[PDB]
Amino acid sequence: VFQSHIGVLAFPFGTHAAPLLTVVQRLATSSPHTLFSFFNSAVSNSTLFGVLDSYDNIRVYHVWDGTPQFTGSHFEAVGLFLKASPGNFDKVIDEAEVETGLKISCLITDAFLWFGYDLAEKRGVPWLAFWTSAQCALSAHMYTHEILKAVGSNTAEEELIQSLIPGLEMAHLSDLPPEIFFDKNPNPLAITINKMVLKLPKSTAVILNSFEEIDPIITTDLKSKFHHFLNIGPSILSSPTPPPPDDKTGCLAWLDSQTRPKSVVYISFGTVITPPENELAALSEALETCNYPFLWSLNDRAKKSLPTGFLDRTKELGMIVPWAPQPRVLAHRSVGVFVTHCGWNSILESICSGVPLICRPFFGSDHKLNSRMVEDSWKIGVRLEGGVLSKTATVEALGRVMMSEEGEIIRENVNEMNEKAKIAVEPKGSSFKNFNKLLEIINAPQ
Ligand SMILES: O=c1ccn([C@@H]2O[C@H](COP(=O)(O)OP(=O)(O)O[C@H]3O[C@H](CO)[C@@H](O)[C@H](O)[C@H]3O)[C@@H](O)[C@H]2O)c(=O)[nH]1
């Protein structure tokens, strides 16, 4: 017998849908008189959907992704999806209400889906926005109007941000998400993100898979901008997953064979980016030179293009796989450092295991800002000389993290940040309390 019905609208691209589903599952676990309907593309849903994931109170729906009836590009697909919005979702929300017999009482959406505000307003329900990155990235976007008003789109560098954005004084204009400055015939995603900024102050709550204590001053600032600003993470600590009885990748058996704690260099650039094959070569040379053991998530093509005899010579030193069980890898006692593209989920996984970072961010999104925070605010890792994996830059970064006095300070900082994350999700912790507040908002008087 359900009393409340929460509609949840995902953004079906990048690493957006999974973190939102995780929050839905956490809320569903605690909300047995509340029904949750999750709306996403059929293609995304087929990647996301065992005993702990079969909820009596979660229904899954597909919405039209806007493609004709993929042959075109990821870029193309995102534009068609946004062109079909919000009518694609509106039609399916009706179906969920008819099938369940319960009108929606609340709408949670990815924060990118600005039109969640319009759908919630039309239905006379609260809109809750789930931001899929850290507070620092959200703050950068929220100051878009003030940034553009101060310096325009086309002295400002290292003066404006330190005067304007609480807690981002260490960031440069060139660290900020580039979509802030894309206002000439903006692409559909830039349009969507700038409409998000305009709507978010009319959210009933903004929800983050972060913890307040990673950036107290930014958190306090954003609490002043939003009705409710609710850091509820890290989800991976609040809500662990039982260890799978096996690991078909071989990674964990290989890490178990390592004889030195904190010795292994784990390398991943995410699900999409591959560095250019001359940068992969430079990294391969640094690994052979430094003789740290390594575990590298790299696609089989890129691997086949590494330098002649590198794979044969390093057979007994490193393991290269097309996919790693990354959270399980980072939790392994043998891992000493993570060479990352500075995606938020990767950084947060690293914090949650006390693994320091070597940062190689690529263009777009919040990766460059995250790299700045890692080196100059959080102080849980280092960036590279020239922002590339040159052999000299890579040997230098590995030395700074693995065998310097600066390295010992970085490891105390990442251990302290791990402790703050754990405290946040335990009873009386900031994230624990914020998640109870979120339950009060969604489940209403009861
Ligand atoms: O072999 C691998 C490689 C990656 N991962 C996982 O893949 C995810 C990668 O996510 P993330 O580190 O956040 O990278 P991006 O998806 O590039 O992240 C950017 O884009 C996301 C939306 O697409 C935003 O939510 C992020 O904040 C933003 O930083 C993580 O959970 C990793 O554990 C694996 O499990 N195995």
Residue numbers in the entry: 2 to 50, 53 to 72, 76 to 160, 165 to 456
Quoted passage from the original study:
In plant biosynthesis, the formation of glycosidic bond is usually catalyzed by uridine diphosphate-dependent glycosyltransferases (UGTs). In this work, we report an efficient phenolic apiosyltransferase GuApiGT from G. uralensis, and dissect mechanisms for its sugar donor selectivity towards UDP-Api through crystal structure analysis, theoretical calculations, and mutagenesis. GuApiGT could efficiently and regio-selectively catalyze 2″-O-apiosylation of flavonoid glycosides, and showed strict sugar donor selectivity towards UDP-Api. This selectivity was highly related with the unique 45-amino acid PSPG box and the key RLGSDH sugar binding motif. Through theoretical calculations and rational design, we altered the sugar donor selectivity of GuApiGT and Sb3GT1.
To further prove the critical role of the RLGSDH motif in UDP-Api selectivity, we conducted site-directed mutagenesis of Sb3GT1. Based on structural analysis, we inserted a serine residue into the motif and constructed the 375S/Q377H mutant of Sb3GT1, as well as the F372R/Q376H and F372R/375S/Q377H mutants. All the three mutants could catalyze kaempferol into its 3-O-apioside, according to the characteristic [Y0-H]- ion at m/z 284 in LC/MS analysis. We further solved the crystal structure of Sb3GT1 375S/Q377H mutant in complex with UDP-Glc at 1.43 Å resolution. The motif structure of the mutant was larger than that of WT, which may be critical for the sugar donor selectivity towards UDP-Api.
